[PDB]
Every structure is written in structure tokens, then in C-alpha cells.
Amino acid sequence: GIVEQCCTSICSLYQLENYCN
Amino acid sequence: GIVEQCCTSICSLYQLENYCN
Amino acid sequence: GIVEQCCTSICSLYQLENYCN
Amino acid sequence: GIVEQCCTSICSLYQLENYCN
Amino acid sequence: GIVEQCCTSICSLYQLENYCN
Amino acid sequence: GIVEQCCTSICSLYQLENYCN
Amino acid sequence: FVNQHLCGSHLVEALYLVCGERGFFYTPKT
Amino acid sequence: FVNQHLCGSHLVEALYLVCGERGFFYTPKT
Amino acid sequence: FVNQHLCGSHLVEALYLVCGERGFFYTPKT
Amino acid sequence: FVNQHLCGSHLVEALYLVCGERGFFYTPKT
Amino acid sequence: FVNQHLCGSHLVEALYLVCGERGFFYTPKT
Amino acid sequence: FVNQHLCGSHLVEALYLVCGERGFFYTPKT
Ligand SMILES: [Cl-]
Ligand SMILES: [Cl-]
Ligand SMILES: [Cl-]
Ligand SMILES: [Cl-]
Ligand SMILES: [Zn+2]
Ligand SMILES: [Zn+2]
């Protein structure tokens, strides 16, 4: 997922925001 | 919660393990 | 400035974009 | 040592604790 | 010590070099 | 430049100081 | 806002900045 | 181990180090 | 997104994350 | 507690968290 | 003072420490 | 260079950057 995506390729803050409660 | 338990008062690394999945 | 806007008071990520080149 | 071990392979917090005074 | 010299009061990068091995 | 130099090879704090205002 | 390459505690820091008082879950693969 | 004030970013970093692979949740409003 | 007190190092880190590639300036005295 | 992969200032941060008010020495090879 | 290998937010942190109240610009290539 | 309040983690990070290879000691109770 995201942890892997942000770290192995790249991610946007908007994608991260999907992890907020 | 965690913020109360750790920032205002203090907590141990062991208490922080309470918030691990 | 930024220090006044963010440390003493609060700011959004959007305000911080004001200081991007 | 530890710096090299924690960085090149992995280490536990319990191993780190060996570096405390 | 260092905590007194740097956190409560202030210190320079040069003073911090006092705590290098 | 510096960002690339500090990250891909290495840089000194004295070199960094060239980026201060 | 730009894309970011984000490993270890940098990921969790960015989640902290982006989520704030809403909080978040940190769910690594295995 | 020991007892410190961990605020903001510092709390989530500590959770990262403590929990690692397991993952964690950060829920200020609770 | 959200509103937090960002002081010292924390402010420049947040600028790094927000601005990235674009770069930024950090000018306390202004 | 889990294993951690820890380079640069992340190592020193973890020592700070683990050792606290007891302190520590940071002793890299050469 | 020693040479340092410095990537991502670590670079910006070091600039913050070295420059202080003088501030700085962060100017990555493209 | 410059004069800042460096507390907690921030102090050890600064020592890391300043001392690097040399290593350092962090002894709060002294
Ligand atoms: Cl890193
Ligand atoms: Cl803080
Ligand atoms: Cl702080
Ligand atoms: Cl702090
Ligand atoms: Zn890092
Ligand atoms: Zn802090």
C-alpha cells in the first residue's frame, strides 16, 4: 500500500490524506 | 488519550505499545 | 512573518505554500 | 558495532539499550 | 551540563563540539 | 548544486553556510 | 503541493502534518 | 527504558520506533 | 488538511514537505 | 518492541528515546 | 566540524541549524 | 553560525551533525 508506494515510488500529500481518521 | 498520557503528563515506551496494532 | 504566522499563532499547509519558490 | 549493525542490518531497542549510561 | 547550557539557556555549534569524542 | 552535492557526495557545514541569508 | 518520496519515520511525520488533530492509522504491509 | 514528554511529531516518531512493522494509530481527539 | 504550531526545525520540515522540488525560503527576521 | 533499521540521525534519536535521562555515548566505527 | 552526507529533510534541518535567525533559501536542482 | 534553544531530540540531532564520525556523548544528568 501507501507506506510501500510513498517509499518505493512516490506519493502526494493528497494520497496520504486517505490515511487520516 | 495518548496526547494527554504523553505530552501533558509523561509515558513510557511500554505505554506507547498500547497504541500498536 | 512565517515564524509569527506559524509558531506563535497557527498556519495551514496552504499558507506555507506562500514561502515556496 | 551498533551504529553499523543498526544501519547495515537491523537492531532491537534492547540492543541499543546497551549504549545507555 | 549540555541540557542546562543549550535547552534552558542557549549555546553555539562550537560549544556543542565540547561534547564530541 | 549543494542539495545534490550534500546528498550524492558529502558537504561540510562551512559549504552549507553559503546558503544562509 | 508536490509529490514526495517518503520512507521510515518520514512517512509518519508527513501523515502527522497532513492529518493533524484528525489523526491516522499507520498500516505497513507485513 | 525511561519517561519523557513526547509532543507533536515526537510522539508519532516514538510510536514508529516502538511499533514498527506492527503499525500504530495516532488519535489525538480520543 | 489542518492547523498546528510549527516552531523551529518543525517549520522548515513542513516547508520541505509542502514545497519539495520547488524549494523554499526560510526568513525568520522578516 | 520490534527490530528497527536505523541510519544517521535516526540512530541517535532512538538512543535518545531508549536511554533518556540516563544518557548515552555515540561511538561510530572510524 | 565534520563532513556530512545529507539527503531530504536532513539537508533542510542542517541549513536551519547552521543559518539560524539569518535564514536561508532551499534551492534544489529541477 | 548561530545561537538557538535545543531541547530533547533536537540537541542530540545537533550533536550528530556537529560531531559526526567523531561521535559524542549525551549526559543530561551532568
Ligand atoms: Cl533518512
Ligand atoms: Cl516540538
Ligand atoms: Cl521543538
Ligand atoms: Cl521538541
Ligand atoms: Zn531520514
Ligand atoms: Zn520538537
UniProtKB/Swiss-Prot annotation, chains G, H, I, J, K, L:
Source taxon at top rank: Eukaryota
Effect of mutating residue 22 to Q: In MODY10; reduces binding affinity to INSR; reduces biological activity; reduces folding properties
Name of the protein in its database record: Insulin B chain
Source species: Homo sapiens (Human)
Gene: INS
